[PDB]
Structure formats: C-alpha cells, structure tokens
Amino acid sequence: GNSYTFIDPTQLPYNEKWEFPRNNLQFGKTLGAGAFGKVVEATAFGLGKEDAVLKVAVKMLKSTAHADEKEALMSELKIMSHLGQHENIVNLLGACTHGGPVLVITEYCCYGDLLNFLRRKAEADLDPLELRDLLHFSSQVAQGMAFLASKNCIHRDVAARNVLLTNGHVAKIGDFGLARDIMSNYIVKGNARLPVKWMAPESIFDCVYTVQSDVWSYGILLWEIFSLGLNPYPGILVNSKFYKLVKDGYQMAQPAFAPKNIYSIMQACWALEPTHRPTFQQICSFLQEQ
Numbered sequence: 067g068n069s070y071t072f073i074d075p076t077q078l079p080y081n082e083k084w085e086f087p088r089n090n091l092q093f094g095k096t097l098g099a100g101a102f103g104k105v106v107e108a109t110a111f112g113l114g115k116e117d118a119v120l121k122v123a124v125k126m127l128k129s130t131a132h133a134d135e136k137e138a139l140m141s142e143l144k145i146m147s148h149l150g151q152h153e154n155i156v157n158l159l160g161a162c163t164h165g166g167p168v169l170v171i172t173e174y175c176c177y178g179d180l181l182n183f184l185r186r187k188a189e190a191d192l193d194p195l196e197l198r199d200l201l202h203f204s205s206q207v208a209q210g211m212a213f214l215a216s217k218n219c220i221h222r223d224v225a226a227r228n229v230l231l232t233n234g235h236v237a238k239i240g241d242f243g244l245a246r247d248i249m250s251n252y253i254v255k256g257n258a259r260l261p262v263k264w265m266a267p268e269s270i271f272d273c274v275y276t277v278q279s280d281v282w283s284y285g286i287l288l289w290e291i292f293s294l295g296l297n298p299y300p301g302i303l304v305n306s307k308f309y310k311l312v313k314d315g316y317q318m319a320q321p322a323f324a325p326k327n328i329y330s331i332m333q334a335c336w337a338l339e340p341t342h343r344p345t346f347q348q349i350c351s352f353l354q355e356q
C-alpha cells in the first residue's frame with residue numbers, strides 16, 4: 067500500500083530505555099486510588115541523571131486487575147513515553163516491566179492537585195491568592211495542552227483535580243488514564259465512567275473527541291480556577307435536564323475572580339461547534355498578554 071503512514075505509538079513495543087529496577091525503589095504513602103489501582107509516593111535511588119535520592123510517584127494496578135486493565139496501563143505508558151518531556155506535564159521518569167507487575171514512574175509534584183490547593187486558600191481566606199497566580203496556573207496548563215495537542219494526544223480528563231503543582235507552584239497536567247493518540251477522530255468505545263461535567267457536547271452526544279474537545283474541558287477548568295474550586299454547574303445534577311441545558315447552549319456564569327477577558331475566553335471555549343473554539347496555541351497567546 068502507501069509507503070507513508072503516521073506511526074501509532076500504542077503499536078510500538080515497550081522501550082527498554084525507561085526500565086528501572088524495582089529494587090531501586092521504596093514505596094511510601096498512597097497519593098490517590100480507585101478500582102483500577104493506585105498511585106503511591108516512592109523514593110528512587112540512582113534514577114536517570116537526577117538526584118541520587120529522588121522522591122517520585124508510581125502508578126500500579128491492584129493485583130485484582132484483569133487483562134483489559136493491564137493493557138490499558140501499558141497503552142498509557144506507551145503514550146507517555148513517545149511524548150517527550152515538557153515543563154507543564156507530569157513527565158514519565160521510567161517504568162518497571164520485568165520481575166513483577168507494571169509500575170509507571172513519574173515526577174512527584176509536592177503541592178498536590180490544583181483543585182484542593184485552590185479550595186484550601188478559599189477556606190483559609192474565610193478564616194493569599196492573587197489574580198497573577200490564577201493567570202499563571204491557567205497559562206501553564208494551556209502551554210502543556212498545546213504541547214499535547216501538537217503530539218495529537220487528546221487528554222480527555224482536563225480538570226483542576228488532574229492538574230498538579232510542583233516546585234515553585236508550577237502547574238503540570240497529570241493523569242493520562244483516558245489520554246488517547248489520534249491521526250483524526252477518536253470514538254468512545256463505551257461504558258467507561260466519564261467526567262460528564264467536563265465533556266464537550268460532541269463527546270457526550272456523538273462519542274467524538276478531538277483536541278478541540280479538550281479546549282472545552284479547559285474552559286471548564288478556567289471556571290474552576292477563577293471560582294477557587296467550585297464544582298462546575300453548582301447544584302445541577304447530571305440527568306436529562308443537564309444534557310438539555312448543554313445542548314441548548316447554557317453556560318456557567320462569570321466566576322467571582324475572573325476578569326471579563328478571561329470569561330470571554332471561557333465562553334469561546336464553550337462554543338458548540340468545536341472548530342469555532344480557539345486552539346490551545348491561541349489560548350497561550352491570550353494568557354501570555356493578560
């Protein structure tokens with residue numbers, strides 16, 4: 067057939083350069099968990115050219131996991147290994163694929179997730195975040211998305227809860243559990259629990275994902291950032307009523323700390339036609355100037 071084809075990174079064998087011995091690894095406390103597995107804190111000894119002793123985060127499935135889920139963690143590993151590094155992504159540091167279950171090792175971000183961070187500040191002030199800081203988080207997530215978009219990697223789980231804050235409070239997009247690689251649609255296979263309040267209409271109603279779907283999600287995140295971590299569509303349950311509102315063009319109101327320019331960016335991300343939404347690169351231009 068045609069001698070030229072795009073290379074599907076999920077089809078590539080595991081790259082052995084990421085391999086790290088599990089006995090150079092010491093597990094600590096659980097950072098987050100589910101039914102799929104967990105992410106734990108660990109100390110890595112002699113990892114890469116980094117600090118000889120290095121605090122890292124490690125993802126693993128619970129021993130209960132079936133063939134389905136083990137394969138989904140390898141796909142995740144494979145996607146993350148082809149991306150290359152960026153300053154605003156929770157980068158992959160290595161893996162453990164021999165001598166035991168699959169472990170995926172990534173940068174440890176000491177201040178945890180953005181959502182909880184924003185909520186602690188909101189609770190502390192009731193008992194100090196500035197607009198500049200909120201803009202910086204927004205701009206940094208945008209930069210990471212633009213990098214992902216430029217790899218044809220659609221994240222599919224853009225939310226304050228999946229943005230993490232590392233040294234200097236630098237924002238990084240984490241959790242690639244639903245990340246997928248395209249090229250030009252991605253169609254939803256089905257029945258995975260999904261983050262409905264962060265999903266673009268075409269993803270809900272047509273099971274279709276493009277990079278412009280992530281832009282919708284990013285707009286929701288902007289709403290989360292500038293409201294200091296309110297749940298989206300506050301007080302409105304996911305049901306028939308919600309889907310109607312979304313399809314008929316309902317949008318959340320301007321949050322307390324969002325300047326008009328940022329709300330306008332939000333609203334443009336919430337265009338029903340995905341191609342009428344701005345690109346992540348354009349969004350980087352907007353926030354670099356604000």
Ligand SMILES: Nc1ncc(-c2ccc(C(=O)N3CCC[C@@H]3CN3CCCC3)cc2)nc1NCc1c(Cl)cccc1Cl
Nearest residue numbers: 097098105123172173174175176177178179227228240241
């Ligand atoms: N790669 C990571 N690096 C750090 C953390 C991480 C580190 C600490 C806390 C935390 O909960 N901390 C940090 C200050 C406040 C809070 C206090 N904890 C101490 C005891 C209970 C909560 C939360 C996450 N997680 C990572 N990956 C897992 C993950 C992703 Cl990729 C996305 C969303 C959630 C998660 Cl868990």
